[PDB]
Amino acid sequence: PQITLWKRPLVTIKIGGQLKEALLDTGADDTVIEEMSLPGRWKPKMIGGIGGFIKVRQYDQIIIEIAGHKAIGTVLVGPTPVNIIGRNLLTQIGATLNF
Amino acid sequence: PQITLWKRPLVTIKIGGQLKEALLDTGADDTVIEEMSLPGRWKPKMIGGIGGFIKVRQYDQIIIEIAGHKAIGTVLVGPTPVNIIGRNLLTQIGATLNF
Ligand SMILES: CN[C@H]1CO[C@@H]2OC[C@H](OC(=O)N[C@@H](Cc3ccccc3)[C@H](O)CN(CC(C)C)S(=O)(=O)c3ccc(OC)cc3)[C@@H]21
Ligand SMILES: [Cl-]
Ligand SMILES: [Cl-]
Ligand SMILES: [Cl-]
Ligand code: NA
Ligand code: NA
């Protein structure tokens, strides 16, 4: 699709067997999802944005379906105010910015 | 151009006659720039990101060049960790997300 930016670019995702809404976010290096359980191992990480840092759990090799396109990658889980799909997964669905 | 996301989507901007680097950020509603001087009056705004809220100075109707495209619009100035071009000016340069 082509997504204009008059509104937030929100899409439906499926992760951990759950459907959620997330923001397609080119300014995010990594994908950060609100607190939820995921299977497998994880390690702690700090990530920073506007406001400062939050502690997250880093899960590797997680499959996510983004607007109907399957991708695999690292997913950070923690107290983000919004679910964010960042570049590590946007690349895998072939997403580009065009102007 | 068509910009892939394997690297940060950094571009050159020009504001107040200075060149700066900024991130094209579809997850940002607003454009937020590191401390600098801008002409005219400002209004208060609080913006929230991953690690909480910050106070910024809101300058309206500021001329800014972004990757060679002219925009004139609102710029927020404050302690952001990186300069961010948000949807308010991404729409002015005609940017879309595509996959
Ligand atoms: C709520 N208001 C926010 C949205 O619109 C306003 O505009 C400015 C601000 O937007 C944001 O902070 N947006 C966030 C994404 C975002 C969106 C919403 C809440 C929090 C974060 C942004 O797209 C991604 N952020 C990084 C940039 C600040 C460099 S981040 O969420 O902090 C982030 C940092 C490291 C990551 O991996 C290492 C992954 C993500 C304001
Ligand atoms: Cl859960
Ligand atoms: Cl990854
Ligand atoms: Cl590619
Ligand atoms: Na894993
Ligand atoms: Na002004």
Describe the 3D structure:
2 copies of one chain form a homodimer. With 99 residues, chain A is mainly beta. The first copy, chain A, has one domain: Beta Barrel (Cathepsin D, subunit A, domain 1). Helices cover 4% and strands 56% of the residues of chain A. The first copy, chain A, contains 1 helix and 9 strands. In chain A, strands 2, 3, 4, 5, 6, 7 and 8 form a 7-stranded mixed sheet that branches. Chain A is globular. The two termini of chain A are 15 Å apart. The interface between A and B is large, with 39 and 39 residues. Bound molecules: ligand 4UY, chloride ion (3 copies) and sodium ion (2 copies). The site of one chloride ion has 3 residues of chain A, from strand 7. It is classed as hydrolase/hydrolase inhibitor. Keywords: HYDROLASE-HYDROLASE Inhibitor complex. The assembly is dimeric. HIV-1 wild Type protease with GRL-011-11A (a methylamine bis-Tetrahydrofuran P2-Ligand, sulfonamide isostere derivate). Chains A, B: Protease. Organism of A, B: Human immunodeficiency virus type 1 BH10.
